[PDB]
Symmetry: C4
Amino acid sequence: SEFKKKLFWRAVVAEFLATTLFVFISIGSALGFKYPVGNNQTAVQDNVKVSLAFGLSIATLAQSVGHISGAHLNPAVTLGLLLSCQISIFRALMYIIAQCVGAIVATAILSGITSSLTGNSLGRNDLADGVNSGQGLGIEIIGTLQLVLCVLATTDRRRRDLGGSAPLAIGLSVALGHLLAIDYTGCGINPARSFGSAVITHNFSNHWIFWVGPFIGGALAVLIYDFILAPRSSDLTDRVKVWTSGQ
Amino acid sequence: SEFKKKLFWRAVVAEFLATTLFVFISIGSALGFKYPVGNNQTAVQDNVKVSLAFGLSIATLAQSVGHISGAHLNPAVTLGLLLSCQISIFRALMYIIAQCVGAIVATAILSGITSSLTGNSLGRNDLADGVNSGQGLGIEIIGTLQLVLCVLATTDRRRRDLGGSAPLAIGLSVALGHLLAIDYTGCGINPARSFGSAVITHNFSNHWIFWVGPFIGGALAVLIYDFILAPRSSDLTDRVKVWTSGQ
Amino acid sequence: SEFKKKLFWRAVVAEFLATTLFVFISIGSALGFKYPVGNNQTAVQDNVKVSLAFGLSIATLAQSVGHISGAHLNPAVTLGLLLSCQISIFRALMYIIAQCVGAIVATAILSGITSSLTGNSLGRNDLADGVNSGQGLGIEIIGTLQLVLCVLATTDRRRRDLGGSAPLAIGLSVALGHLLAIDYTGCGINPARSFGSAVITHNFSNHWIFWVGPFIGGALAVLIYDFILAPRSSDLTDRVKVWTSGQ
Amino acid sequence: SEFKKKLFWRAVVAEFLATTLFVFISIGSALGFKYPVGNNQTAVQDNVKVSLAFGLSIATLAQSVGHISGAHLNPAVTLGLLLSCQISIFRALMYIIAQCVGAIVATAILSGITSSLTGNSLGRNDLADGVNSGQGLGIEIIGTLQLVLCVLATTDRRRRDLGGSAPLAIGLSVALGHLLAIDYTGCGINPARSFGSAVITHNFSNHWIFWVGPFIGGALAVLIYDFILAPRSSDLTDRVKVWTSGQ
Ligand SMILES: CC(C)CCC[C@@H](C)[C@H]1CC[C@H]2[C@@H]3CC=C4C[C@@H](O)CC[C@]4(C)[C@H]3CC[C@]12C
Ligand SMILES: CC(C)CCC[C@@H](C)[C@H]1CC[C@H]2[C@@H]3CC=C4C[C@@H](O)CC[C@]4(C)[C@H]3CC[C@]12C
Ligand SMILES: CC(C)CCC[C@@H](C)[C@H]1CC[C@H]2[C@@H]3CC=C4C[C@@H](O)CC[C@]4(C)[C@H]3CC[C@]12C
Ligand SMILES: CC(C)CCC[C@@H](C)[C@H]1CC[C@H]2[C@@H]3CC=C4C[C@@H](O)CC[C@]4(C)[C@H]3CC[C@]12C
């Protein structure tokens, strides 16, 4: 059904292009503080700058392509919307493929642009010194939990009290996740964004954390919103049919 | 009445979960600058980072659960809404219990994740050197006064001139309170959030400030908004019945 | 006419209280980086923190009391709205008196709170090294010009394309003014806000700038909006009657 | 036709004045970290401060002159709106002339105000060390691509899912571009902004980047939004008539 519709593939291309722009802008801001190359200064990474870069990139690209693709730009957000039965399995898989490919393309272009940097890690997510696998996993879980919870609540379609900009809300949620998680894990929070850096730098050490934790956080947010706090008066059988229908 | 309504208990569970997420994300962001552990560096706390963490946490969680519970997430805001005769006594008590227990749970999990920090104060609010109990009390009073005043004016329901995101407004008020009070008192203003850190660290020195100042500030905000600036044309006899009925 | 109305004096008290809260919170955030007092550290003032403090203070207080008083909180803004003939002369006079008194009271209370700071300037506005009277005057004129222009455009009442939060718009304008002018003059931008610090510290050197420049900027913004960009097709004789009628 | 209309010339004057205010305030905030002059301190530029200055200046001036001129304030945005056939060729040319002249005027006044800085580059855009022409070109292309894409998607007039403040959305897009590109190229992103600095400082080294890259980014944004993501159901022949008609 969705395979033969041009609106679906425009949405997939929108996901690819917006993910590329998001990853490029955000990881470019994360690599900004290392410049100039020659100038030997005790340059310290600005966490507010990087968090605002990721968050405002999400806000701007959501404002740009929300009416076209839903402005997911995150495999965990897409999986959360899948488990809340809002999107089909095929749309979820195509969105995840598009997001990962767009992140890989953006990170390759960024490796080209930042070629003067020696030891260019391309913003690859890894555990800080003092944070082990479980602690970083919990960091990723909570960050993605708040993100997917905000995404689910913003698009309930039963809410008449909603006001203001939904893209701004999702962007500030991403920025909040970064303000939490940058000092602990670099704030993957987005499996495609971490996957692109891991692929380009050929380093997948502890990379399973940044795929497992965000998915657990998305599942927990789905459970919290759709089975504890704001349940829907609809049978699970009718909702599951969206997986094969997309309705 | 409210005791036998499932929607009331959904709201209470929403307050518990959202306060847990708020405390965890905000204090974990406040503890970020102490990482890495092995790296001997004279790192300083970035106050904008922590203020934005608290503010955007409040804004995001308000967007998530405000239509479910009102998203108080602050015993001062709950007491202000009780004193403005908008909620019942039972709802206020259940909200305060849920917020405090959720804060304790979040701080326990956070001390679990940040166990590598030696002498971890877990974001416990304490007076800065040069500030006595009275000065920190005044700072807390003013921060809570502005926060509760913004909450009361945002939910007036007699206003048609409101626009934009009310969760964003309340979050930016929380961030304003933090931009004020982080340097002076570690920025409490939320008695549950202070209480969780005090319980986990087993340290209650000067803890009366962060329960008295927020309550005085909330009560003063109620007085200002309901009996100086925006009086209601209702007898107090009708408004008192909201305490026992919850209407 | 307005002398014998309860709503008029409620608005005046709202202006007084909101100016008190604004001056207190913002200047207290400006002084925060000096704490702890005992610790001998070369901490540097964070311009983003102070600018966000002023801006979020204006935004929060506008969201609180704009429906009551209009949330001017600035003698330059009040003078601009008088020259654009939106308020009466008596309302402008009482608003400016209330704003100055509130700033004086807030600065007194904050000086009481920040007594342990030796050589405390209380955020007194003065020129930096390398900036003479003319350059600081120009910076103040431009900052207040953009502030008053935003206020005039946001309250046009002929506009149907206005969206989002007007208090947030005015607050971000104030934050922008501080981002421009903190390094040059400390960003007076607000004659009452500087007048309070000058009165409490008993230092009026170069203080004519912060009462001349903001008023010039307000008058220029009135000229730009009401006579160049979006003129009103109403007689100047008719708009004169607003000064003595308020309608 | 449009040459003799009062509203057209009001829009042109609004573009000139708002571009003057934008350039002045943003580049004044950019040069502020070098003050005080006498104090010998190793001051480091705050990228968040300058990025927020640019973005909030764009948001405030859009809120001020959007209903009069559309608030481009950027030759790349004007070129994008021309190529998407939203304005005429005459309007676009007059807008670009006004923006360049306003940037020149603002930079001249600012060099008058920042005269005490020795070797004052007036925030002139140039490549950082480690960045050659291709890398800076790519950075400028991507930043302007995201900006123009956000502008095109925001002013669509076919969308009913838009909420919040469009000026704030465009301002956050500008701030995001600066957060990305300040460390690499100073974030031209705006050919008029770079042009004024280059003209006043009499230095055009690599100045072609900040005219070509923004225009390439705007053209790519127009291509992406109009012929990949959200095509319009009209013939190109009908849309071309806007170039000579303005309707
Ligand atoms: C909020 C919940 C549901 C998600 C996060 C919980 C998990 C991932 C976290 C939170 C608390 C964590 C534990 C807390 C304390 C310690 C002791 C330390 O010496 C080794 C790791 C260990 C054993 C942590 C492992 C991972 C852990 C269990
Ligand atoms: C809105 C109100 C209730 C909050 C602020 C008022 C209170 C808490 C503040 C404002 C004035 C303050 C006092 C002002 C001056 C001093 C002198 C100093 O050597 C010791 C502290 C002391 C005695 C302060 C204690 C705290 C204080 C009383
Ligand atoms: C648009 C206008 C009205 C706003 C600001 C303009 C005024 C206040 C500013 C801008 C340019 C400034 C001048 C620029 C250069 C100098 C040389 C310096 O050695 C003494 C001050 C003096 C003479 C400045 C005085 C103040 C000045 C005239
Ligand atoms: C995505 C598009 C629209 C914008 C960015 C693409 C262009 C401008 C980028 C992408 C790849 C880049 C190249 C990657 C690698 C190199 C080798 C290096 O030693 C010099 C720069 C140079 C030659 C770069 C020049 C700029 C470049 C061609």
